[PDB]
Structure 1
Amino acid sequence: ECLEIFKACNPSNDQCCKSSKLVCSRKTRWCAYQI
């Protein structure tokens, strides 16, 4: 029920699964993994 990798992520719409390994990349505008 969340976003995926390389998916347009927003600050107000942080749907990206931040509980797994999906975090809105700071540099890019697309969600990235989490080392």
Structure 2
Amino acid sequence: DCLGWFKSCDPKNDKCCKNYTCSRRDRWCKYDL
């Protein structure tokens, strides 16, 4: 499964779903697409 956004992730080892992106700035997944 994946993470929903606002959950903490690693942008290079992204575990969040697509449409959302894992932020290197916020260090968590966000909806930005």
Instruction: Provide TM-score, normalisation by structure 1.
Output: 0.64
- The aligned counterpart of 2:29 is 31
Structure 1 residues without counterparts, runs of 5 or longer: none
After the TM superposition, list the runs of 4 or more consecutive aligned residues in structure 1 that deviate by more than 6 angstroms. Answer: none
Compute the RMSD of aligned alpha carbons: 1.3
Higher Cα radius of gyration: 1
Structure 2 residues without counterparts, runs of 5 or longer: none
Q: What percent identity do the matched residue pairs reach?
A: 50
